[PDB]
Design an enzyme around this catalytic site. Sequence first.
Site, PDB file in Angstrom:
ATOM      1  N   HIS A 131      40.684  17.134   5.814  1.00 15.48           N
ATOM      2  CA  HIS A 131      40.495  18.379   6.543  1.00 15.48           C
ATOM      3  C   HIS A 131      41.833  18.952   6.990  1.00 15.48           C
ATOM      4  CE1 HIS A 131      41.366  17.024  10.691  1.00 15.48           C
ATOM      5  NE2 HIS A 131      40.885  15.863  10.286  1.00 15.48           N
ATOM      6  N   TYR A 166      35.363  11.896  20.284  1.00 17.73           N
ATOM      7  CA  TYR A 166      36.029  13.167  20.039  1.00 17.73           C
ATOM      8  C   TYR A 166      34.988  14.223  19.705  1.00 17.73           C
ATOM      9  CZ  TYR A 166      35.460  11.195  15.371  1.00 17.73           C
ATOM     10  OH  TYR A 166      34.952  10.596  14.240  1.00 17.73           O
ATOM     11  N   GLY A 200       0.775  -1.226   0.000  1.00 12.91           N
ATOM     12  CA  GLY A 200       0.000   0.000   0.000  1.00 12.91           C
ATOM     13  C   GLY A 200       0.806   1.277   0.000  1.00 12.91           C
ATOM     14  N   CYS A 205      40.281  10.196   9.548  1.00  8.03           N
ATOM     15  CA  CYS A 205      40.310  11.268   8.581  1.00  8.03           C
ATOM     16  C   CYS A 205      41.718  11.398   8.008  1.00  8.03           C
ATOM     17  CB  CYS A 205      39.955  12.615   9.206  1.00  8.03           C
ATOM     18  SG  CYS A 205      38.308  12.558   9.965  1.00  8.03           S
TER      19      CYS A 205
END
Length: 349
Positions: free
Chosen positions: A278, A260, A178, A296
């Site tokens: 970064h 962190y 549905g 990272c």
Amino acid sequence: VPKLTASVTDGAVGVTVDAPVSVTAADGVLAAVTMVNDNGRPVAGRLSPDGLRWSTTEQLGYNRRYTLNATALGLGGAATRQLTFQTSSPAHLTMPYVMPGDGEVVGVGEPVAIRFDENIADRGAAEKAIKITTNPPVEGAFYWLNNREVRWRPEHFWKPGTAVDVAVNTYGVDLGEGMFGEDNVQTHFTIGDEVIATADDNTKILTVRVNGEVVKSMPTSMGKDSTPTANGIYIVGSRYKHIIMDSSTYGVPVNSPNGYRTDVDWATQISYSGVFVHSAPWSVGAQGHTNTSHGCLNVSPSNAQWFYDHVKRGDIVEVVNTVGGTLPGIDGLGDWNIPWDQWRAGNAK
Ligand code: NA
């Protein structure tokens, strides 16, 4: 004697609203056609110049009852019909959302993404309702990352200059249990320059290549042995002049050993699991030598800003020779890590 035909039959139920309602006169012409809903509101329609075909010109509504009156005239005689029908009454509605944005120029790694806001019981119906156009035409396939998002990409990275058109025609379509689509979506994007950046744990260098030429060599510090950066292919996502990285958004408490909460500059996202490129002033000495981060790719401020300035959504970052594993294909930006034969076959069930 003129004959009348319609795209719906009197007394019909569950008439889907993905298509318009038409009426055709044979051996004659249509003198009058009207269609109104349960409330008596007329539906917009247009008659053809030859007077043979009439079709609704606006999309129809769910859980409605429509009444159709048609008259046909001719040299011989006249014919009139009245038809009433009920459209489908969905149990739930789901709206799709498509990335990249309309008009965007994206790198060679950007997949087509259709995300719904509800779980999709009938993936095959969803794939059937999505039409992808490529120029130059190239083979691709659908693959589902979770229950709500599906992706479409070719075997190899896009060829620069490729036009892509995405028509998500889910309005009126039963997507299972549905669940009907809330609307249709139509987006178009283009593939820009080839930009492939490689991060080699052996050299600890992130090299950016534009159209096959090295244009920037960045010393970097990746994930330490305890929380390493995974190898594999990453798709560049969003870009941020500055962003507060909070481990809690990934289910890792800040007060935990691996948690962190650090504010960084010039952050380019390359994985949903929190891997970024970064600016990291605090590790410029480690950069190019040892790994000290949570995952990272730490680089210098100037290099991070340069990455921000010269890297666009859809560009590729590949990581190799790290102590970690391989970025999950289901991650959200790891589509290209799924072998082609598996992706091609799909997981529609
Ligand atoms: Na009704």
